[PDB]
């Protein structure tokens, strides 16, 4: 607890207040998901969730995920082989899409359950919270025996984070039950004893839900301006393989990853300010002077067709971009692009590691480039799904790249191009309407929205992840 506060002072209090940091790790046993929520100017929140509290433990979840991934990977690489047979290939992938969707639903429902609100990006409102506290403590007085121990606000925020309780058809009964057990356990832990069977949980759910409706009614009447809130995940070595960002509760929200708090801190202090406001919190990369590497191995003819004219028209011609098309970049060219281009686009097979050595990405004085690796398994997870210090992405992060977009497993060209085109429009690298005015989402926000563009949200889009901090395109900057 002493150690954690040193972390708050020396790392978290430097993180923009509209951002919060969540670390995910496992207990030594593997039985518990450990969740820490960190935000500048906020008390740290530490959560320890036993996965089996209610046939589906972590080993089982991870095993199912890796098998699905194995089969997905198998489908990309058959693609060509199947010559009639075309119908069967598609049927196989849609079915895997359905399997992965189901797995993520089960993870959110079973593992997180009523604790999903820990991932909530809602704005904290002390005045409304004090009302909820009063009503909820009232609930406690009315329905418990031992009818003294007071709950931290962060615990109450879990209730708030379940979502808008005033939504037509909203049903929080299991979640609320789950959280009430938590409260009884905390009280119990702090010297207020209570037998489970002597509590009318079913009445408490009803009164608490009404209390949440009261909160959100007030919250809805007076909503705060758009925060441009971002979540940054710190993941244990074996948890990178999980597409956390594609869980129902994080779907569409701006979420990136960072290898460590040390990384995070370095990147924040390296931020470039806009040439010219929550947007000023991100790193700003000029549109001018980027590099794109398009179809380096020459066989991605469909991909080249998709982007060549657009990149010529919108990037190379007016914005002084370096163009590399249907030829491999030499390693010095690649390194030079990383040093000098604010944005590097890689549209090729894999991570591009066939074109640039890992050990040479470390020799770089500074990686200026924000790097998009649009290729198979470009996050370079291990066969066992682990994030290792030797992959390209880790190296970019160590060199100081502000962000890196990559994939957790293998993907088809057509569907990843859909995603990529989405990122570029939303990020403001390309004009609105290109794939069918210039937008300006953060890179993290643009990635989250662009998942919508894929035919398969899970088989393709769930693979897409971003390591780093929010990056904004600075159109007139230099």
């Amino acid at each position: 607890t002493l150690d954690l506060h040193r972390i708050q002072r020396d790392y978290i209090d430097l993180v923009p207040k509209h951002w919060h940091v969540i670390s995910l790790s496992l207990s030594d046993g593997g039985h518990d998901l450990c969740i820490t929520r960190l935000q500048a100017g906020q008390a740290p929140f530490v959560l320890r969730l036993p996965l089996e509290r209610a046939v589906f433990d972590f080993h089982t979840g991870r095993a199912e995920l890796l098998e699905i991934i194995k089969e997905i990977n198998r489908t990309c690489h058959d693609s060509r082989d199947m010559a009639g047979e075309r119908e069967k290939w598609w049927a196989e992938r849609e079915a895997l899409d359905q399997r992965l969707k189901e797995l993520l639903m089960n993870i959110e429902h079973v593992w997180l359950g009523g604790f999903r609100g820990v991932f909530s990006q809602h704005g904290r409102r002390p005045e409304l919270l004090e009302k909820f506290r009063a009503m909820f403590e009232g609930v406690l007085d009315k329905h418990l025996p031992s009818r003294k121990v007071v709950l931290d606000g962060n615990v109450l925020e879990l209730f708030i984070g379940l979502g808008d309780a005033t939504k037509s058809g909203a049903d929080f009964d299991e979640e609320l039950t789950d959280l009430l057990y938590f409260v009884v356990d905390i009280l119990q832990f702090h010297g207020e004893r209570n037998a489970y069977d002597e509590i009318d949980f079913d009445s408490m759910v009803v009164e608490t839900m009404d209390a949440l409706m009261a909160y959100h009614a007030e919250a809805n009447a007076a909503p705060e301006s758009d925060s441009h809130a971002h979540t940054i995940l710190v993941l244990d070595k074996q948890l990178h393989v999980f597409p956390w960002e594609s869980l129902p509760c994080l779907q569409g929200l701006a979420v990136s990853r960072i290898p460590s708090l040390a990384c995070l801190r370095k990147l924040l202090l390296d931020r470039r300010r806009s040439s010219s406001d929550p947007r000023s919190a991100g790193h700003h990369a000029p549109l001018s002077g980027g590099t794109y590497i398009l179809n380096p191995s020459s066989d991605l003819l469909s991909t080249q067709k998709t982007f060549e004219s657009l990149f010529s028209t919108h990037l190379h011609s007016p914005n002084s971009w370096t163009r590399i098309i249907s030829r491999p970049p030499t390693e010095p060219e690649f390194l030079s692009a990383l040093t000098h281009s604010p944005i590097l686009l890689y549209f090729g097979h894999g991570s591009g590691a066939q074109y640039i050595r890992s050990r040479n990405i470390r020799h770089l004085d500074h990686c200026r480039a924000t790097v998009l690796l649009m290729g198979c398994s470009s996050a370079a997870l291990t066969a066992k799904g682990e994030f290792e210090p030797s992959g390209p992405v880790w190296n970019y992060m160590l060199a100081g790249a502000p962000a890196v977009v990559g994939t957790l497993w293998d993907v088809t060209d057509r569907d990843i191009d859909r995603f990529a085109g989405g990122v570029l429009e939303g990020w403001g690298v390309l004009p609105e309407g290109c794939m069918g005015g210039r937008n300006g989402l953060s890179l993290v926000q643009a990635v989250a929205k662009a998942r919508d563009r894929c035919r398969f949200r899970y088989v393709t889009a769930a693979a897409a992840v971003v390591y780093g901090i929010p990056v904004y395109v600075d159109v007139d900057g230099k």
């Binding site: 060509r80 649009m374 198979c376 060209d413």
Partner: peptide, 4 residues
């Protein structure tokens, strides 16, 4: 589609 082609596997990238």
């Amino acid at each position: 589609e082609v596997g990238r």
